[PDB]
Amino acid sequence: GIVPVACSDGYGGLVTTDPKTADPVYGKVYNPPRTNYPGRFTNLLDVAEACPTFLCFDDGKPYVVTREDEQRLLAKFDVSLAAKHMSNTYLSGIAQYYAQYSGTINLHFMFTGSTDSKARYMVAYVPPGVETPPDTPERAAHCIHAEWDTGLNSKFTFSIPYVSAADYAYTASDVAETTNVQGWVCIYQITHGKAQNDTLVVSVSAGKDFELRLPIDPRTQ
């Protein structure tokens, strides 16, 4: 006779992410050639590496200004792609569409003061385990940090490590629960000479081993 089959139950329905194709209806169509079209990207993390975008500090500025005060803490923000400072970034705009991440996150610090104005800065990674971050560089000198002054080269890149218990981290902070699961990043002003209104621009890009893991679609539509 003919081949008998078993029309299984549970199989067949449409899943919107299934790995199979549809059947065609319009054959023998040729496209106009787009050989060597400029500006192609095949990975989002390539663009996220090569193109850093600005952070958003108080008053919505991409930079922190030196302060004529006793306070040496310029800015402080959670290590979270959902932080208030990263809300306007491309790394964050990409990371909102994924469940988990892992790897390095690079910060760039560009000094835009005059030539006759010097300064010395410091950035520290404060992993979780304390309730409040430190507000003195003398006390934050015991974390992982780096120092740098101003000169001919006006840029400085610091790489935030991925240190945690699990192999991956959520790209979204759960609820009003406090004390971010990852640490904080604290920028300090060690000293400065004749730098009253000079600024330091901050931006962020993805590291060498950064990775986003599980695609989702979380926005209200």
Partner 1 sequence: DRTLTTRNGHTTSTTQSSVGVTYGYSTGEDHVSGPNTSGLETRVTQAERFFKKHLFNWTTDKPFGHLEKLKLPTDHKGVYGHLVDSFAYMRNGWDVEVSAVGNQFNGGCLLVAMVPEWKKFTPREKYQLTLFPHQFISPRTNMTAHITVPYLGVNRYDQYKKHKPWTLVVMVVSPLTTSSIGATEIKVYANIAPTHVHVAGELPSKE
Partner 2 sequence: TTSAGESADPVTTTVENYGGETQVQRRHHTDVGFIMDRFVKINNTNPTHVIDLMQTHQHGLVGALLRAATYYFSDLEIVVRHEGNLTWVPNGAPEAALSNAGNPTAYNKAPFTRLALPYTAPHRVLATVYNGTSKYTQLPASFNFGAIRATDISELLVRMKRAELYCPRPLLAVEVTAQDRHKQKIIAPAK
Partner 3 sequence: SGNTGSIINNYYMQQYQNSMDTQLNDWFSKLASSAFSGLFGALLA
Q: Which residues bind a copy of itself (CB under 8 A)?
A: 1-15, 17-20, 22-27, 29, 32-33, 166-168, 213-214
Q: Which of residues 191-210 bind partner 3 (CB under 8 A)?
A: 208
Binding to partner 3 in span 126-165, by CB under 8 A: 153
When asked if residue 161 is in the footprint of partner 2 (CB under 8 A), the reply is yes
- Contact of residue 71 among partner 1, partner 3, partner 2, none (CB under 5-8 Å per partner type): none
Residue 170 touches which of a copy of itself, partner 3, partner 1, none (Cβ within 5-8 Å per kind): none
Q: Tokens representing 210?
A: 């950064």
- Give phi and psi for 44, each to the nearest 5: -70, -30
C-alpha 163/C-alpha 182 separation (Å) is 8
Residue 217 binds which of partner 3, partner 1, partner 2, none (CB < 5-8 A, kind-dependent): partner 2
Rounded to whole angstroms, the Cα distance separating 150 from 110 reads: 10
Using CB distances below 5 to 8 A depending on partner kind, what does residue 13 bind out of partner 3, a copy of itself, partner 1, none?
A: a copy of itself
**Judged by CB, which is closer to a copy of itself: 8, or 115?**
8
C-alpha dihedral over 89, 92, 94, 97, to 10 degrees?
-150
Residue with tokens 């610090």: 109
- 75 CB burial (10 A radius; 0-12, 13-18, 19+): middle
Number of residues near partner 2 (by CB under 8 A): 106
